[PDB]
Nucleic acid binder design. Structure first.
Ligand SMILES: Nc1ccn([C@H]2C[C@H](O)[C@@H](COP(=O)(O)OP(=O)(O)OP(=O)(O)O)O2)c(=O)n1
Ligand SMILES: [Mn+2]
Ligand SMILES: [Mn+2]
Ligand code: NA
Ligand code: NA
Length: 327
DNA sequence: CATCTG
DNA sequence: CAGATG
């Protein structure tokens, strides 16, 4: 957790670059288990050879830890923190809509910067276009004082469209958090479930409303159950308008809301421990459900939940307010 | 995993 | 449809 920090870190930068710049998925993948392993290792790695000793750790990495250990640096890492081509790919990639794949093409084509992007707004697809447009706003965190306003609005309109909706803003917003990155909303309706054959409007009616009143400003992606957009708090008495916010909306059949809802609320750490214990208590959990575990190895069968309360209950646990869902 | 693009 | 992004 700090006894093997640099090592795990350099390894990461290394790993990272493999996949993002080169295409070295294997390689990249190599750095990972490696940093993951040294990560757990109880001691102070004083040498390469000592490390090699670990699984996932071969010769080359060992060689690396050496030079790193031996000196406060690594050549190859030093060669990379410079290289303009590498730097560009990390940068371009910041644009929502631009992955690495794309990060590469652009650069090869000479687009390495934001200006480069605007100049060639044409090669950019819609999502990317927006991405470019709100680069700034996108990177800005979301102070909960805003969040509360957003939530206020979303909730009023969903309500208006149908009293039967059920919306929930999960995320860290949900877990207390002073500010979040984007707004995730869970959505269900009674008239939509596991079996129930579809009902797209269920999602669209609301999306519409939201833009009806201008909260939603753009659409990143709009499928029948998921919606990726942009929203924005009405700018008051003109002098101070709000940054544009990343927002997602998802239709979930009523019969699996809470597992979902529970799930989205994190934290990852709260998840696993919860899952780990579930396992003990004779169960299984995932994104959508909870199932009574057979002894034959495994087994399923959807245990019925009417709240986060039903779930915990199941695993015979202490109902955790969202705040304490931290770890 | 669900949506988009081409 | 494979392949990219989130
Ligand atoms: C799990 C982790 C999160 O609680 C949720 C997925 O939401 P995000 O990936 O957006 O993560 P958060 O909601 O935690 O992040 P943010 O700080 O962006 O709100 O599911
Ligand atoms: Mn988001
Ligand atoms: Mn979020
Ligand atoms: Na990106
Ligand atoms: Na292939």
């Amino acid at each position: 957790e700090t006894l093997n920090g640099g090592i795990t870190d350099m390894l990461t930068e290394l790993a990272n670059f493999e996949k993002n710049v080169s295409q070295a998925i294997h390689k990249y993948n190599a750095y990972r288990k490696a940093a993951s392993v040294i990560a757990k290792y109880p001691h102070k790695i004083k040498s390469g050879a000592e490390a090699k000793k670990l699984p996932g750790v071969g010769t080359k990495i060992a060689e690396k830890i050496d030079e790193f250990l031996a000196t406060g640096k690594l050549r190859k890492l030093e060669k990379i923190r410079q290289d303009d081509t590498s730097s560009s790919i990390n940068f371009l990639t910041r644009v929502s809509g631009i992955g690495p794949s794309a990060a590469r093409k652009f650069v090869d084509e000479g687009i390495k910067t934001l200006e480069d992007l605007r100049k060639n707004e044409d090669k950019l697809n819609h999502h990317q276009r927006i991405g470019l447009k709100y680069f700034g706003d996108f990177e800005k965190r979301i102070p909960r004082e805003e969040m509360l306003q957003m939530q206020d609005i979303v909730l009023n309109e969903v309500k208006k469209v149908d009293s039967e909706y059920i919306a929930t803003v999960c995320g860290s917003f949900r877990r207390g958090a002073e500010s979040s990155g984007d707004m995730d909303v869970l959505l269900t309706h009674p008239s939509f479930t596991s079996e129930s054959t579809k009902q797209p409007k269920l999602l669209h009616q609301v999306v519409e409303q939201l833009q009806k009143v201008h909260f939603i400003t753009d659409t990143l992606s709009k499928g029948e159950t998921k919606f990726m957009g942009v929203c924005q708090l009405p700018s008051k008495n003109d002098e101070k308008e709000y940054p544009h916010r990343r927002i997602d909306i998802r239709l979930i059949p009523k019969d699996q809301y809470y597992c979902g809802v529970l799930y989205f609320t994190g934290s990852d750490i709260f998840n696993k421990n919860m899952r780990a214990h579930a396992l003990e208590k004779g169960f299984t959990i995932n994104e959508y459900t909870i199932r009574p575990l057979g002894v034959t190895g495994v087994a399923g069968e959807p245990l019925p939940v009417d709240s986060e309360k039903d779930i915990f209950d199941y695993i015979q646990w202490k109902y955790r307010e969202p705040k304490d869902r931290s770890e």
